[PDB]
Amino acid sequence: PGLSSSACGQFVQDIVSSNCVVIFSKTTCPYCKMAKGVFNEIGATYKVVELDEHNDGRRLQETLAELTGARTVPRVFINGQCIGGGSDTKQLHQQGKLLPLIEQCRPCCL
Numbered sequence: 001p002g003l004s005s006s007a008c009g010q011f012v013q014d015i016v017s018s019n020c021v022v023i024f025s026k027t028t029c030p031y032c033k034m035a036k037g038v039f040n041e042i043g044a045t046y047k048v049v050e051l052d053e054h055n056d057g058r059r060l061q062e063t064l065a066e067l068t069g070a071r072t073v074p075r076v077f078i079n080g081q082c083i084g085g086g087s088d089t090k091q092l093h094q095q096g097k098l099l100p101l102i103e104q105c106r107p108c109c110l
């Protein structure tokens with residue numbers, strides 16, 4: 001394959017590839033607590049990157065803006081695809097559309 005054009009990009013590619021569910025988050029953001037919440041509800045473990053605990057948080061926020069079209073947290077990724085923020089997470093879940101997205105993630109043995 002190919003390499004991203006910066007460490008920011010690489011990092012986002014990397015963690016979004018190694019993980020079914022990724023939440024780029026802030027510890028102080030209620031929409032992030034909401035999204036994390038629905039995932040705990042489902043019983044899906046996920047990877048969190050707290051951008052306010054990261055020395056490069058602002059640069060990562062910029063990269064997520066370029067990739068996903070919004071800089072707001074949370075930026076939620078299922079199976080390499082950004083599904084949007086907290087309301088999207090919540091709303092997909094309420095419509096029973098989320099668990100299927102999660103179920104498309106390759107299985108442990110693969």
Ligand SMILES: N[C@@H](CCC(=O)N[C@@H](CS)C(=O)NCC(=O)O)C(=O)O
Nearest residue numbers: 029030031072073074085086087088
């Ligand atoms: N509609 C968005 C709203 C999320 C949101 O407003 N996050 C706030 C903090 S809770 C934010 O991005 N502030 C700008 C920033 O943190 O840089 C969603 O559901 O995720």
